[PDB]
Symmetry: C3
Subunit: 124 residues, 3 copies
Amino acid sequence: KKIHTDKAPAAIGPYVQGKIVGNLLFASGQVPLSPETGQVIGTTIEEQTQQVLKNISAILTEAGTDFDHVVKTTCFLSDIDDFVPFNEVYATAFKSDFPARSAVEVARLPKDVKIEIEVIAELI
Amino acid sequence: KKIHTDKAPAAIGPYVQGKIVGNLLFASGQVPLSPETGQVIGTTIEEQTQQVLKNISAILTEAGTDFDHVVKTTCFLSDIDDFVPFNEVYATAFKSDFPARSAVEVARLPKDVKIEIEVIAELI
Amino acid sequence: KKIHTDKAPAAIGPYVQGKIVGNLLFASGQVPLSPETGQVIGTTIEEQTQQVLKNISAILTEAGTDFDHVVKTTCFLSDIDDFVPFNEVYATAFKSDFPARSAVEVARLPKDVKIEIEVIAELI
């Protein structure tokens, strides 16, 4: 069972936005792309993370879950040095019950954005 | 329970090719190695991805699942400029049913291969 | 349910050390930090891997599982050429029932450490 919403960038190619197995939602890595203009939103890790989170949120909602039910994320950064500012904006979506996390510096990301996040979540 | 198949490269030392928990298969990242010669097959992203996918296929079969029942993949490229041909070959293992995906360039993979793909798949 | 133990590095901020969902513990990736001092432990891939493994131990223990019941790990190395020494240390924790694995070289890790391991595990 699959996720489609026009409130996050559309799956163009051989994947979906996310997919559900039992109570678990596995989302595709989200990037700082606008679901409206398809452009990269923002020029800073701060702006870009906010976009990524907007995009994740849309996916959780359409799946009938929420930020507070994310059990685990993997954060991909282009520059581990962004980590502090990155963290401040991450924390605006997850404020209370926190997910388990890994955060590493990869070499490149689609479009050389600064941040890509994937999330795994429990259904409400 | 573990998974072993002669049709994917042999698991040497402290891992297995795949492990099942409840209804879920967590397969190890597959590289374009020949289960029969123990060597890297292919000189292009195209050939290499082909072998990765065979390797993965063997494991799913062994595990009582298939590509249509793969829920989430992670595709680690040695070079994101290879993305377009990767994505064309990747598509051919699927039909209308796609998994959630992330795909990133990592700095290096075992034996300097171009592609490594981990899957998580639901058991039929 | 969130996991916390004093015997793994403390969760500074907007993650937790481990999160349970159904029968699954998803632990934050672990680095070679001392829970007592907060510093990097080890200069070699061997000593750092040991520290990581203890941090994992404390978490599995806290959650009421152990190494035998780990389904899948991801090993982020800063240098793939470290693989053999790291594999050997990696072995000392996993006796009989090995998890699936993926191992890739990232550009960079927090604090410029050589190794970070995330684990997924079933509750005894």
